[PDB]
Design a protein around this ligand. Structure first.
Ligand SMILES: [Mg+2]
Ligand SMILES: [Mg+2]
Ligand SMILES: [Zn+2]
Ligand SMILES: [Zn+2]
Lengths: 589, 589
DNA sequence: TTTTTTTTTTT
């Protein structure tokens, strides 16, 4: 019953952070600068500053938030009077609630309590409007009266029309007045539980969440998010009894987090090492022995090149990798690692995917009856990585649907009266087997690969893996047994900080090409084309795409070291890795 | 008539177990300590204690369960006052009801009586909430009153709204208040009669069951269960009568069991025998003569290896077996035995299965038009064994769908805008025929097997069965005729005991590899690779998967004897069995 | 009719 409003202001005005800079007065300082009407607090900070204040938010969230928000609004107005007439209400969001419940473990006892759920966002609906205070007109020739229907209370989830006119006490028919109605932004989304917590032999469960006001459009499908709010039962058709007094539960979102300054200097410290490139390469798939050239190639695809956007056209900045090898060469294990270390990645297989599922699918809503598009794997992976294992198992009639997405990075649809064009700027990493399961050295490369030259030319690098039992078997056997015995390689960058390093590099680093790098690349390309003319039977063609592959690879190498320009050293590395690619496919220079 | 609360409390505090250790008091504090809020009792024990009490439970169940629930709650409160305010109700569940009725024999006379049904779980719905006590607000400008609608009575299965406001006596509008409404967990499941119970020439029947409160998520689809509760008629759509006074029936589950200390003593006693491994192998398919190496191989697949989960990757721990042989070599009979003895197994046929049905199917829900996922055979067999007979009859373009699930133990779907990943950690035992029905010795092994090298490398062991007539025919004929004569081989572990032994071993034994075993395994693998390179024509490739097969087989042998370490003896057995596999496919060692 | 995944008969 004690007044907590005064506790809030002294908390906000007076608080010391880890950096000792009064972190919580700059956020409100920027609150009026951009008029975002939303302030973020941490439960750990509120607990340390006042244990009693923290508890009251947890258990009395229903009837403490409007008072707490109202107190903050008065303080903001005192700081700057111009905030008036721009924002009517200011929301404060609480994160870090210790009450974390798994999606499958929610029971009846959790209804009406503030909880947190971690999951995957799978579906988002367009932003709509919800009525919380309506205005009606009594259509009865004596009344012609206006009145806000829900008195001293907001409109519930179910819309209800008055039966007795409050202005005359008589029944009749009432007409809604949209211009005098108060609205609020409304959005619906579906959260799916992570695959880690799914029990054996069961399908993942889903939960419906509601985003309102400024929380709309705060995430995209495929993101991993943490949502905090209040559970409630969902009402859809209360008018129809139809027996079955059984309801589904939904969650009203109060705050959402999508999966800091100390990381920046940690990343900067790593980039200062002259051998950072070797450290990153050694940190790719530590459980796999050997395959150094493959690990280097996979590292480049994670960073990628610099996309170019011009007045008349744009140039792809992503790097595509194709691996062909004998079974058991650990191709799939490295692809699994890539899908975990990448900040955004989608893992698909050749057999378990279709053309519609990879790019875009036309789905007809049975209720309304109209067609609309559904995002495929490549569209959802925009700005990230797409992994396509067992690419050779795809039907050739179905695999050609990704030809334009791999180069033009767009998906074109002309179906069921829908014409659209969606961006699919995603790097593609694929693996497969030769025509006869294992590579046959007694036959030409033409019949071993069994892939059209059109798709081969779209891959920046192609590595052919051969399982040759030699003198390294003992070393390979010892390494594998050490892994099975729990022994772990040391002096490597762990996956968590490695993911942060890649995300930072792809966002703030844009290398530039210098004059000396141009000459090295130009000379090498001429030799590549000249050497290719010697053997025209090979299904590997040296097209102008190969020249742009060198530019992208060179930029990727500089991006690993966080350099702002491409020097001759980065150009030399790009030539070296390209040379190994050519030797694998049988082109020797 | 009389009150049994004193007897019930006395029975719990005075009953004696098998060792007269009062097997019921130590369950009470376990209920208090974990707040499990559900206690079970045995009907045999109650009958053995007081016959009159058992009859009252078995007959007057609907008027004695609340009475015993209240008596139990009071005894808990005095034992521990902290139990209050956390659990407001504790249910007691009675099992072992003598009233057992087949699913097909249920008639109107059994309605309203406590019965028990044994069947197979097929469908489970997500957990929902059911209202048992509602709260309404009369929307009439004079009332603004809140009240609990169902007075001194639980809310029926049909949602009924008040017609006359009790607080004012007038009709009008009533608004539900979710905050004051009381809810209870609710789940719906479907149970099917056992295949051995279905009459000739008819499809199996199904029954709908309801699980509430703590009984939700008590089992997974495909389980074998025994459900006890009260039968009742189902009221689903009472809005319009439409004549048709005919109703279905459904079961309100009171206690459910799936498929102990005395068993543990029996299991541990078996492991003391030095020849337990030989004794176990002799118990595999006792009705099949010969095929000792096959029975040994099948025994290993039942136990499996030790899966390894690391911070960056995971390693398969399951063992896959492939059998190729001439027709009439008892391949199908042995596979049928594995289905019976395995704690969890799924039997499929190559011709009677599809790619979608084996892994996962995307189907369009008719009511809404939205696509959703259906679990395949491999997903349902997670943590168990998947049996695929006539694998050679599968279409090659369709058989490749299981390549991912056999090594990475995952199922990936990218179809119709659905991207998902599912766990399929199951062991695969497959059988089939050579290319020409019977094995042809003139032709090489490559054209006889007629399988791609990719699928072959996935199998830990491959055995080729040749039906060669010889001097052993007389022994085989005598053995078969004795089986038809009713004679049974003795000194073999019965199937029920063997199933318990395997389940215990797979749950509590995690063998570790010693230094001595590492040296033996490494030497053999190096030797295998050298021999393979000498004859680069066989369809079997010695990939690094073969090295991991040796580790998995070694752990299985140790796990068979409930050993915590892999000594050198287990390594020699693993090497020896692999030698027989290599000689079967014509690879000399 | 229309796109989609699926098992099925029949174009
Ligand atoms: Mg693979
Ligand atoms: Mg057979
Ligand atoms: Zn009026
Ligand atoms: Zn009233």
């Amino acid at each position: 019953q004690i007044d907590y409003r005064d506790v809030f202001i002294e908390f906000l005005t007076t608080f010391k952070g880890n950096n000792n800079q009064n972190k919580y007065i700059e956020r409100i300082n920027e609150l009026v600068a951009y008029r975002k009407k939303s302030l973020i607090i941490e439960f750990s900070d509120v607990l340390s500053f006042n244990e009693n204040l923290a508890y009251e938010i947890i258990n009395n969230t229903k009837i403490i938030l409007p008072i707490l928000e109202g107190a903050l609004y008065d303080h903001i107005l005192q700081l700057d009077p111009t905030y008036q007439r721009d924002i009517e209400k200011v929301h404060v969001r609480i994160v870090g609630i210790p009450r974390v419940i798994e999606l499958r473990k929610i029971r009846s006892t959790d209804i009406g309590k503030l909880i947190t759920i971690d999951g995957i966002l799978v579906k988002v609906t367009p932003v709509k409007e919800r009525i919380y205070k309506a205005t009606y007109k009594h259509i009865h020739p004596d009344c012609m009266q206006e009145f806000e229907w829900p008195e001293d209370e907001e409109m519930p989830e179910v819309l209800e029309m008055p039966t007795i006119c409050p202005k005359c006490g008589k029944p009749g028919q009432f007409r809604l007045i949209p211009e005098k109605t108060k609205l609020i932004d409304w959005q619906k989304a579906v959260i799916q539980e992570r695959p880690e917590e799914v029990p054996s032999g069961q399908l993942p469960r889903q939960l419906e969440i509601i985003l309102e006001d400024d929380l709309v459009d705060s995430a995209r499908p495929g993101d991993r998010v943490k949502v905090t709010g209040i559970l409630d039962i969902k009402q859809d058709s209360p008018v129809k009894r139809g027996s079955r007094a059984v309801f589904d539960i939904y969650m009203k979102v109060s705050s959402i987090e999508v999966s800091s300054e100390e990381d920046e200097k940690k990343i900067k410290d790593l980039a200062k090492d002259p051998w950072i490139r070797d450290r990153i390469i050694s940190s790719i798939a530590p459980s796999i022995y050997g395959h150094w050239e493959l690990k280097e190639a996979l590292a480049l695809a994670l960073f990628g090149g610099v996309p170019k956007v011009l007045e008349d056209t744009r140039i792809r900045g992503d790097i595509h990798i194709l691996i062909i090898g004998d079974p058991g060469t650990a191709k799939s294990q490295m692809l699994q690692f890539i899908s975990r270390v990448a900040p955004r990645a989608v893992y698909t297989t050749g057999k378990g995917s279709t053309a519609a599922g990879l790019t875009a699918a036309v789905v007809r809503e049975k209720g309304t009856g109209e067609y609309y598009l559904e995002a495929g794997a490549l569209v959802l992976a925009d700005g990230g990585i797409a992994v396509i294992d067992e690419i050779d198992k795809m039907r050739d009639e179905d695999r050609v649907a990704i030809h334009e997405a791999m180069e033009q990075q767009t998906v074109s649809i002309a179906k069921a009266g829908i014409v659209a064009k969606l961006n699919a700027r995603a790097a593609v990493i694929a693996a497969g087997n030769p025509k006869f399961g294992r590579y046959i050295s007694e036959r030409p490369v033409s019949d071993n690969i069994n892939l059209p030259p059109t798709i081969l030319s779209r891959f920046d690098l192609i590595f052919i893996l051969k399982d040759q039992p030699g003198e390294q078997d003992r070393e390979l056997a010892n390494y594998i047994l050490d892994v099975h015995s729990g022994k772990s390689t040391k002096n490597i960058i762990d996956i968590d900080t490695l993911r942060k390093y890649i995300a930072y590099a792809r966002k703030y680093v844009t290398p530039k090409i210098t004059s000396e790098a141009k000459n090295l690349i130009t000379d090498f390309f001429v030799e590549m084309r000249k050497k290719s003319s010697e053997t025209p039977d090979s299904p590997i063609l040296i097209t102008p795409r190969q020249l742009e592959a060198l530019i992208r690879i060179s930029e990727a190498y500089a991006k690993m070291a966080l350099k702002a320009e491409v020097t001759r050293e980065d150009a030399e590395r790009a030539i070296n890795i390209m040379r190994l690619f050519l030797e694998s496919v049988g082109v020797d220079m």
